[PDB]
């Protein structure tokens, strides 16, 4: 419900190292192949870090509805980013019931894409005025997550980081690494010295 957004600018990122790790085994990407986005430059990168169940993965999808999709974080159809996740029963799932995480269960309207609602208004859905109390159609709509080590993997915590990409007339602040080759002297070579090339 309070998904953190961080702007990443002016650095170099090795994207395919995360793919060649085999420990974060979700890796859902839209727009471009993981190898091509490694050798691709962008103006800004936005990271969305949050934790869901093992069954709410379908809610993190454009064109798909749901409490996570419509009341917590909405994915636009024109999405060219990446979603990464893994299993975190080691320090997020704890004995006795991990009730630390929250999610918006009710809202008077569906969230727009790239919108966050953190208001603690009592959700009125009936005729009796709430006036801040809990009761009939009068609920604090931030339902709590529940995690246990004996819970199913469909209900086990996955920490999810969502990558975002944007482009404008502003220059590409972030990009990926550029390969280097050992130089050869006294030979006919086909070189590309930085942008400049020649034979």
């Amino acid at each position, epitope marked *: 419900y309070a998904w953190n957004r961080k702007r990443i600018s002016n650095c170099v990122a090795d994207y395919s190292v995360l793919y060649n790790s085999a420990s974060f085994s979700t890796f859902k990407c839209y727009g471009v192949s993981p190898t091509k986005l490694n050798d691709l430059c962008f103006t800004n990168v936005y990271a969305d870090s949050f934790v869901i169940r093992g069954d709410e993965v379908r809610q993190i999808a454009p064109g798909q509805t749901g409490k996570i999709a419509d009341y917590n974080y909405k994915l636009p159809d024109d999405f060219t980013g990446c979603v990464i996740a893994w299993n975190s029963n080691n320090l997020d799932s704890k004995v*006795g*019931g*991990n*009730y*630390n995480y*929250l999610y918006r*269960l*009710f809202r008077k309207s569906n969230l727009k894409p790239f919108e966050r609602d953190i208001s*603690t208004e009592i*959700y009125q859905a009936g005729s*009796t*005025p*709430c*006036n*801040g*109390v*809990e*009761g*009939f159609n*009068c*609920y*604090f*709509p*931030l*339902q*709590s997550y529940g995690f246990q080590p004996t819970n199913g993997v469909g209900y086990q915590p996955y920490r999810v980081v969502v990558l975002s990409f944007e482009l404008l007339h502003a220059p590409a602040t972030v990009c990926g690494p550029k390969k280097s080759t050992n130089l050869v002297k006294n030979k006919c070579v086909n070189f590309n010295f930085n942008g400049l090339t020649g034979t």
Partner: antibody, heavy 116, light 108 residues
């Protein structure tokens, strides 16, 4: 573990601040909304406020709306009050809680103390 | 607007193993959001029936909840000296969070 400490009973002048501590030991946190019920000797119990531990906002009734201010802290897991009542408002506070679920019945579950 | 809880009767004098009926109503319709509570002078308040139709864990089958609409009924059999205490109606319906007037039963 299943006990909250009761502060000493105090008599106060009108316009004087009153305090009460409700410790929460064990269990899991950020799940139950802490709550306060005021009752007098010879008078029935009446609710006045809750604090949700997620943001510390306050839920009030009609009687004490604008009279009592309440808060809670998750580091000490204790709820505190600031309130300047009169001498005739001498009454005992009881600290209650309960996992207020959404989509089902919303009422206190357990954790009823022994006094102020 | 305001919602109030009315308990009838406000006092009883029941012996051991009697049939105690408590009729708890409100000014407006209550679907299932009402609870019956036990409070003895000198102890913490303990729940008897939550959501007006469910038995409380740690509380035996000597108490039952029934009724709907306007009127809810707390039905008690097999009275004991530990059973004679104060009956409370606790709403969870709407604002304000009003409680019952209190119904203390004591052995004759």
């Amino acid at each position: 573990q299943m006990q909250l400490v009761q502060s000493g009973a105090e008599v106060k002048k009108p316009g004087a601040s009153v305090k009460v501590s409700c410790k929460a030991s064990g269990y899991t946190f950020t799940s139950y909304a802490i709550s306060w019920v005021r009752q007098a000797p010879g008078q029935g119990l009446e609710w006045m406020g809750r604090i949700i531990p997620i943001l510390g906002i306050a839920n009030y009734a009609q009687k004490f709306q604008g009279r009592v201010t309440i808060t809670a802290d998750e580091s000490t897991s204790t709820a505190y009050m600031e309130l300047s009542s009169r001498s005739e408002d001498t009454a005992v506070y009881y600290c209650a809680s309960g996992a207020f679920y959404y989509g089902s019945g919303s009422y206190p579950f357990d954790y009823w103390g022994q006094g102020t | 607007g305001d919602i109030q809880l009315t308990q009838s009767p406000s006092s009883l004098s029941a012996s051991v193993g009697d049939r105690v009926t408590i009729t708890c109503r409100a000014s407006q319709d209550i679907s299932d959001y009402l609870n019956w509570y036990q409070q003895k002078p000198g102890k913490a308040p303990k729940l008897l029936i939550y959501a007006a139709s469910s038995l409380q864990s740690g509380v035996p089958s000597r108490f039952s909840g029934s009724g709907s609409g306007t009127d809810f009924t707390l039905t008690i059999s097999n009275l004991q000296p530990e059973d004679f205490a104060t009956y409370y109606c606790q709403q969870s319906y709407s604002a304000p969070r009003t409680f019952g007037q209190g119904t203390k039963v004591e052995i004759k």
